[PDB]
Structure 1
Amino acid sequence: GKIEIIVVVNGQPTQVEANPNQPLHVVRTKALENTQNVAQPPDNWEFKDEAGNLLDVDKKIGDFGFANTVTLFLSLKAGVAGA
């Protein structure tokens, strides 16, 4: 049963269809291309669920036990610059 993921990528939401046997870094590659966020190295992005837990991109999309429609977040690490 394929899952329809909405990835909020740096505040810009996009939608990626995923098969449960794919590893999660496929949804990451796909969302980062839909939103043209391909400059930064992809490891700079934190894949998190709605409660903000950090998800393993190697773990398979089915292993997360997501429902048919799920909203994830692709967010940068919090910054340090202020001066």
Structure 2
Amino acid sequence: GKIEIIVVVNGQPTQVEANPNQPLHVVRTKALENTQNVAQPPDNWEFKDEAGNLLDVDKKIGDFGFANTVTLFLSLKAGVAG
């Protein structure tokens, strides 16, 4: 029943085992920890699939109907300097 999600953060993949009853934001937190991406908090990142669709991070993993392995891209909502 578990889904293996390969989360890619700044080009770096990390494999997160996801429970169907868990919201996607649980995967966001683990992926950012695994890849050591801390400069913006989890709130500031969003998931896109390989077609650029933005995924609802509050939706339970099982409600996406994923294949046994899927790749998702976790990317910043905004980047600002000045």
Same fold judged by TM-score > 0.5? yes
Is 1:61 aligned to 2:61, yes or no? yes
CA displacement at 1:81 relative to structure 2: 6.8
5+ residue gaps, structure 1, are none
Cα distance in 1 between the residues matched to 2:17 and 2:70 = 10
How many residue pairs match? The answer is 82
* Divergent runs of 4+, >3 A: 77-82
TM-score by length of 1: 0.88
SS at match of 2:80: coil
CA displacement at 1:72 relative to structure 2: 0.4
TM-score by length of 2: 0.89
Contact 1:24 1:59 in 2 (8 A): yes
Cα distance in 1 between the residues matched to 2:27 and 2:77 = 19
SS at match of 1:80: strand
More strand by share: 2
SS at match of 2:36: coil
Contact 1:10 1:76 in 2 (8 A): no
Contact 2:24 2:58 in 1 (8 A): yes
Contact 2:44 2:78 in 1 (8 A): no
CA displacement at 1:46 relative to structure 2: 1.5
Contact 2:46 2:57 in 1 (8 A): no
1:2-49 per-residue CA deviation (whole Å, 9 max, x = no partner) reads 000000012111110001000100110110100011331212212111
Contact 1:4 1:70 in 2 (8 A): yes
Percent identity reads 100
5+ residue gaps, structure 2, are none
Cα distance in 2 between the residues matched to 1:76 and 1:20 = 25
